[PDB]
Design an enzyme around this catalytic site. Structure first.
Site, short mmCIF file in Angstrom:
data_model
loop_
_atom_site.label_atom_id
_atom_site.label_comp_id
_atom_site.label_asym_id
_atom_site.label_seq_id
_atom_site.Cartn_x
_atom_site.Cartn_y
_atom_site.Cartn_z
N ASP A 7 0.80 -1.35 -0.14
CA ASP A 7 -0.05 0.01 0.03
C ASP A 7 1.03 1.19 -0.07
OD1 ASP A 7 -2.54 1.23 0.61
OD2 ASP A 7 -1.95 1.66 2.73
N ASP A 9 -0.50 5.12 1.31
CA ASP A 9 -0.73 5.83 1.99
C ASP A 9 -0.75 5.13 3.83
OD1 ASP A 9 -1.21 8.21 0.53
OD2 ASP A 9 -3.02 6.95 -0.31
N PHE A 15 0.84 10.06 4.78
CA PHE A 15 -0.76 10.95 4.47
C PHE A 15 -0.90 11.64 5.92
CE2 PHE A 15 -5.02 10.98 2.15
CZ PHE A 15 -5.66 11.40 3.38
N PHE A 41 -9.98 4.46 10.66
CA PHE A 41 -9.23 4.59 9.30
C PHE A 41 -9.49 6.10 8.66
CE2 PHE A 41 -8.85 3.96 4.64
CZ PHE A 41 -7.80 3.56 4.66
N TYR A 62 -6.73 17.36 1.38
CA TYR A 62 -6.50 16.01 0.73
C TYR A 62 -6.89 16.06 -0.60
CZ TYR A 62 -10.36 13.02 2.88
OH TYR A 62 -11.52 12.64 3.34
N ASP A 142 -2.26 -0.39 6.07
CA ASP A 142 -2.38 0.10 7.43
C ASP A 142 -4.25 0.36 7.54
OD1 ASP A 142 -2.68 2.19 5.27
OD2 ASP A 142 -2.83 3.81 7.06
O1 LIG Z 1 -8.78 9.26 5.51
C1 LIG Z 1 -7.98 8.74 4.55
C2 LIG Z 1 -8.58 8.66 3.38
C3 LIG Z 1 -7.92 8.24 2.31
N1 LIG Z 1 -6.72 7.67 2.53
C4 LIG Z 1 -5.88 7.03 1.34
C5 LIG Z 1 -6.15 5.44 1.43
C6 LIG Z 1 -5.93 5.05 0.00
O2 LIG Z 1 -4.63 4.68 -0.32
C7 LIG Z 1 -6.52 6.36 -0.81
C8 LIG Z 1 -7.92 6.27 -1.40
O3 LIG Z 1 -8.83 5.97 -0.32
O4 LIG Z 1 -6.43 7.50 0.16
C9 LIG Z 1 -5.99 7.71 3.76
O5 LIG Z 1 -5.25 7.20 4.13
N2 LIG Z 1 -6.88 8.22 5.05
F1 ALF Z 2 -4.21 2.26 -1.41
AL1 ALF Z 2 -3.74 3.08 0.11
F2 ALF Z 2 -3.51 3.74 1.60
F3 ALF Z 2 -2.44 3.72 -0.80
F4 ALF Z 2 -5.21 2.31 0.86
MG LIG Z 3 -2.79 3.05 3.54
#
Ligand SMILES: O=c1ccn([C@H]2C[C@H](O)[C@@H](CO)O2)c(=O)[nH]1
Ligand code: ALF
Ligand SMILES: [Mg+2]
Ligand SMILES: O=c1ccn([C@H]2C[C@H](O)[C@@H](CO)O2)c(=O)[nH]1
Ligand code: ALF
Ligand SMILES: [Mg+2]
Lengths: 192, 193
Positions: A7, A9, A15, A41, A62, A142
């Site tokens: 993954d 983020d 993030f 999350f 974001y 995560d």
């Molecule tokens: O609160 C949030 C919202 C989105 N994402 C990331 C997860 C994923 O890789 C992408 C789309 O959901 O953005 C996070 O990490 N936290």
């Molecule tokens: F796909 Al991701 F955090 F990069 F859920």
């Molecule tokens: Mg993630």
């Protein structure tokens, strides 16, 4: 070969630190959620609980041009992925989901990988909202639970520790990686 | 049990070959070109290089330009077929497509093309990957002659979708070609039920 899906983020790119820094710069008068206090999350839902109008404010951070492009790397992450991809009988893909508001997310993720890891890693990106239809032995992510159309995915989910999941209670059947300085090699070895 | 169908974009849903020729004739009007039914082989750039060396960089500049993917026209019957397919009981559809190596004006434009032509519900069904063999499904409908990658034995059966560059091929009796979206695709799905 062992195939590892990784993954972005919260695993490769910070993030949560980026979101907090952007919120404090854009809305300097407003209350915030310190990283140590994050639970669950989706950050937007914790901000909604703090005060309703804060949900759309934090989402605006974001969703903005440059947000994904400018994130800083997680400590040890880039070096770990380089080492992992170089190991014998091991394959790495970066398996990541776009936001529903995809406009400033999809191209910026490709450019972030190109700059921080180089062109060869760009060819290893898989973009999908459903990771359960991707074949592999391990998924390092995560997110509390990773779900989709396959009721029983091919991969074992390894929970990567982040501020929002640190306090989450898990049965002995679910494995956790504490950081990239924790023993990831032993986890890969368990699939050989 | 549910049947999962993976559907390619260029040459199956979106007319890449017609778009490429139209853009080349517009920008490079004096240069020699390749008529569509003269096309042979998957990569158009290499047939143009064979025609005259300087044409390889010229034809590549067309498909690498801002707007190229965004502006492609749909293939006849394609959008209706995907809608009908996704509405069938015990059936799931994903759009499984690859970016160019020069990704800059391709990735975001493919997402926007799907949003505009099929809607937000189909955007959530996009899988972007350079390796389709690591995606799980029953069927892959794709104009590329052979679809390869890390898995030697993919989960899906490849159904060759007829396009100008592959029309010359003759498949053995053990394999299936889809002539067009009017060529009874429902019977192919029924074989997996
Ligand atoms: O609160 C949030 C919202 C989105 N994402 C990331 C997860 C994923 O890789 C992408 C789309 O959901 O953005 C996070 O990490 N936290
Ligand atoms: F796909 Al991701 F955090 F990069 F859920
Ligand atoms: Mg993630
Ligand atoms: O000559 C070419 C070059 C690229 N593509 C498409 C195939 C794929 O969907 C994407 C990336 O290779 O562009 C073609 O259809 N023909
Ligand atoms: F949309 Al394609 F190969 F033609 F992924
Ligand atoms: Mg194609």
């Amino acid at each position: 070969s062992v195939r590892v899906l990784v993954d972005m983020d919260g695993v490769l790119a910070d993030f949560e630190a980026g979101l907090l820094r952007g919120f404090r710069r854009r809305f300097p008068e407003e209350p915030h959620v310190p990283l140590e206090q994050r639970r669950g999350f989706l950050a937007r839902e914790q901000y909604r609980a703090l005060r309703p109008d804060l949900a759309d404010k934090v989402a605006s951070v974001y969703e903005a041009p440059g947000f994904f492009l400018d994130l800083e790397p997680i400590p040890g992450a880039l070096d770990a992925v380089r080492e992992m991809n170089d190991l014998p009988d091991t394959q790495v893909f970066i398996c990541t989901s776009p936001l529903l508001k995809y406009h400033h997310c999809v191209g910026e993720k490709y450019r972030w990988v190109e700059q921080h890891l180089g062109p060869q890693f760009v060819e290893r990106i898989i973009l999908t909202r459903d990771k359960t239809v991707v074949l592999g032995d391990l998924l390092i992510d995560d997110k509390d639970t990773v779900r989709g159309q396959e009721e029983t995915p091919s991969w074992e989910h390894i929970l990567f520790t982040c501020c929002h999941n640190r306090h989450l209670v898990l049965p002995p059947t679910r494995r956790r990686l504490l950081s990239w300085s924790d023993n990831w090699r032993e986890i890969l070895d368990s699939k050989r």
